[PDB]
RNA sequence: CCUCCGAACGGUAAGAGCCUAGCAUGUAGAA
């Protein structure tokens, strides 16, 4: 179970444990649990690149400790 | 191949002492403006249309499939009709033996392009007292567009006053490359001709594949068997290699060409026979009236005029 | 500005009516092509013209937040603020369904609880099929009664947070609305 | 004296010159330069969306003798629009 | 048995160049 930091630089910096087999939807659900924003209202970016919900975390190579930029929809 | 007066002082010193370094094509110096409109996205992915001028993805490819490159290759095609590699097939007088006219074949070979399939209905009555000497009267070609393997022609068969005295010997088609067998497209075309045209008789039908050989042409006479003809007519797999083909579907034909009989040539009365450059007319409902005229250039000014609009 | 609220408008729910759409989605609408091409200088006459050409309803879709034309027209009316009876003419139309649902959504965002119930409960009797675009861009076949049920029961419709409706039984116990007489 | 803003009844030819390459020399004017040109504004913009921002801007509409005020249509106008489309189809 | 899970900053290329914004105001004197 890898651990990903999902950071909003204004301030929402959150720490989320997740599986590698998890899709981005499951990670968004965990971020929703730990932030209060609804999971379908959360965008995970890499400086401009939007991670898509149907792709597993292993495919994106989101490894244990990596930061993901938190944006909203 | 240099100029001795153009040599500099150090150039002469290097010539006398040792040698000089060359420069291969693999050595690349990757170390006016043409605006281009491209459908891109912005940084946020908003699907915009931009007009750029930086020459960094502008290298044109233009290889083997361009109208300009194909036309340049078609240039000097008349000089490639010298070594006419005829095919001595094993046709032991099955029906009317192939006695074709040399002038008509020479004109047809030099008037076709080696990019798409160019074909034509070669029909003609047999000569006087022809027991095993079929008559290669002339080839009539209507507007059509051809693929890399088989050429699509108009649905309606030819019907002309000069064709009243001529019987349909078969259909000639020039393949892109050489192949020691009838292609699935050729078999499908033969089956369609036999099913639709009553003049495409079983033993009376032929296929003069005037393919493009290496350096010269390759004229192979072939015929379709009854069962093979039925299979090629019902074969819905119209690709380069369909499923449902057997070696018995086609057989060779023993024939030759001579210049004694000056054959005719059916040209289009309305538009040019080679209509591949304009693919908005080669449809199945084509009912055109042919005429007694020579075939037009494969890339003539009227064969594909749409490129000249720019 | 093409997106400023008209300067002869009310303040619906205490705020600028355009603010009834979430700010992120408001901005995403503002930078869309449909809002800049097909939603400029529109009056309440031409909102009808664009509305009859709608082929689906929905909010936003894709990894990028791309508004649908339906949501863009909703925001355009929130900007224009057409009169109430114009919206009743929108809803009372029976031939073009998407115009009716567009008017119903505007009424839901804008009208009070009495207006919302009184004007949208008659639409439970409409069972015409409709296209609705998912978040992934796909299209699903819903029904007009299901859309009205989402308007009157769900917090979020077309990815818009809706103004909070008073529950029906509170207005019923206040005599302001007679019980919901169905078609059965 | 500024008239009210009117909705454009014509479609915009944003997609018209895709692939159509323009050779740009010194002597070429801005009219035939790459991108989009506001003949009313005499300005060049190199995005479709940025050109849309321009033709939806205060300065472009000012050059047309317009304003940022939209006509308030009435009941009968909307009703007659409904009947007009009903008749047309 | 062991449960204390922190954060922000030290992360701006400098230019050119054209377009539209948010802004965000604009309510006072007078003949």
Cα(B187)–Cα(B249) distance, rounded to whole angstroms? 8
Annotated resolution, angstroms: 3.1
Determine the number of helices (DSSP H) and then strands (DSSP E) in chain B. 5, 16
Dihedral (Cα; A60, A61, A66, A67), 10-degree rounding: -20
At residue B144, what are phi and psi to the nearest 5 degrees?
Answer: -165, 165
Residue C105's nearest CA partner among C166, C65, C51, C50 is C51
Question: Pairing state of beta strands B118-123 and B170-174?
Answer: antiparallel
List C139's β-bridge partners, or say none: C133
- Count the neighbouring beta carbons within 10 Å of the beta carbon of residue B21: 5
Q: Which of C42, C48, C85 sits opposite D7 (nearest CB)?
A: C42
What's the length of chain A? 73
Cα(A55)–Cα(A26) distance, rounded to whole angstroms? 10
Q: Name every residue whose Cβ is closer than 8 Å to that of residue C73 and which is 6 or more positions away in sequence.
A: C39, C47, C50, C51, C54, C102
Determination technique for this entry: cryo-EM
CA distance B228 to chain A (A): 51
Contact in structure between C79 and C18 (CB atoms under 8 Å): yes
Cα(A66)–Cα(B106) distance, rounded to whole angstroms? 73
Cα(C70)–Cα(C68) distance, rounded to whole angstroms? 5
Residue B267's nearest CA partner among B257, B277, B259, B275 is B275
Cα(C5)–Cα(C2) distance, rounded to whole angstroms? 9
Chain A touched by C25 (CB under 8 Å)? yes
Structure letter (DSSP) for residue C162: P
Cα(B172)–Cα(B222) distance, rounded to whole angstroms? 10
| Pairwise CB contact (< 8 Å): C25 & A40 | no
Contacts of residue B38 in chain D, CB cutoff 8 Å? 18
Contacts of residue C33 in chain D, CB cutoff 8 Å? 48-49, 52
């Amino acid at each position: 179970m890898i651990e990903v930091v999902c950071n909003d630089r204004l301030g929402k910096k959150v720490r989320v444990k997740c599986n590698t087999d998890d899709t981005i939807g499951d990670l968004k659900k965990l971020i929703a649990a730990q932030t209060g924003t609804r999971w379908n209202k959360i965008v995970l970016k890499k400086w401009y690149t939007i991670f898509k919900d149907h792709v597993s975390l292993g495919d994106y190579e989101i490894h244990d400790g990596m930061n993901l930029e938190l944006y909203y929809q | 191949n240099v100029n001795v007066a153009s040599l500099t002082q150090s150039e002469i010193r290097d010539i006398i002492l040792g040698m000089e370094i060359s420069a291969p094509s693999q050595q690349r110096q990757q170390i006016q403006l043409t605006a281009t409109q491209t459908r891109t996205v912005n940084k946020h992915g908003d699907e915009i249309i931009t007009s750029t001028t930086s020459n960094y993805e502008t290298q044109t490819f233009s290889s083997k499939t361009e109208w300009r490159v194909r036309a340049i290759s078609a240039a000097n095609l008349h000089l490639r009709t010298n070594h006419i590699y005829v095919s001595s097939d094993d046709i032991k007088e099955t029906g009317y033996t192939y006695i074709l006219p040399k002038n008509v074949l020479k004109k047809f070979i030099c008037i076709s392009d080696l990019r798409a399939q160019i074909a034509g209905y070669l029909y003609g009555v047999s000569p006087p007292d022809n027991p095993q000497v079929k008559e290669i009267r002339c080839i009539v070609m209507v507007p059509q567009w051809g693929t890399h393997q088989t050429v699509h022609l108009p649905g309606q068969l030819p019907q002309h006053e000069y064709l009243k005295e001529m019987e349909p010997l078969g259909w000639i088609h020039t393949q892109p490359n050489e192949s020691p067998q009838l292609s699935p497209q050729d078999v499908t075309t033969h089956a369609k001709i036999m099913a639709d045209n009553p003049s495409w008789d079983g033993e009376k039908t032929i296929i003069i594949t005037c393919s493009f050989t290496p350096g010269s042409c390759t004229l192979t006479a072939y015929k379709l068997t009854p069962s093979g003809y039925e299979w090629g007519r019902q074969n819905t797999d119209k690709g380069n290699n369909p499923k449902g083909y057997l070696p018995s579907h086609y057989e060779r034909v023993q024939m030759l060409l001579s210049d004694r009989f000056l054959g005719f040539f059916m040209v289009p009365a309305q538009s040019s026979w080679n209509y591949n450059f304009m693919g908005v007319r080669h449809d199945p409902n084509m009912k055109y009236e042919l005429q007694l005229a020579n075939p037009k250039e494969f890339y003539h000014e009227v064969h594909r005029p749409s490129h000249f609009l720019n | 500005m093409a997106n400023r609220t008209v300067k002869d408008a009310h303040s619906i729910h205490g705020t600028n009516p355009q603010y009834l759409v979430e700010k992120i989605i408001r901005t995403r609408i503002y930078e869309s092509k449909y809002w800049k091409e097909e939603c400029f200088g529109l009056t309440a006459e031409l909102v009808v013209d664009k509305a009859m050409e709608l082929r689906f309803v929905g909010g936003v879709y894709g990894g990028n937040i791309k508004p649908t034309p339906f949501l863009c027209l909703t925001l355009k009316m929130l900007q224009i603020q057409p009169e109430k009876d114009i919206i009743v003419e929108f809803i009372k139309n029976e031939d073009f369904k998407y115009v009716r649902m567009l008017g119903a959504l505007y009424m839901r965002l804008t009208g009070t609880a009495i207006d919302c119930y009184k004007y949208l409960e008659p639409l439970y009797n409409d069972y015409r099929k409709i296209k609705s675009q998912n978040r992934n861009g796909e299209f699903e076949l819903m029904h007009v009664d299901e859309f009205i049920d989402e308007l009157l029961h769900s917090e979020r419709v077309c990815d818009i947070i809706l103004p909070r409706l008073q529950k029906r039984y509170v207005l019923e116990e206040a005599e302001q609305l007679e019980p919901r007489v169905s078609a059965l | 004296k500024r008239e009210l803003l009117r909705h454009r009844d014509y479609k915009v030819d944003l997609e018209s010159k895709l692939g159509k390459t323009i050779v740009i020399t010194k002597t070429t004017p801005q009219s035939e330069m790459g991108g989009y040109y506001c003949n009313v504004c005499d300005c060049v913009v190199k995005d479709s969306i940025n050109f849309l921002d321009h033709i939806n801007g205060k300065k472009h509409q000012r050059n047309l003798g317009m304003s940022m005020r939209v006509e308030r249509s009435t009941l009968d106008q909307v009703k007659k629009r409904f009947e007009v489309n009903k008749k047309k189809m």
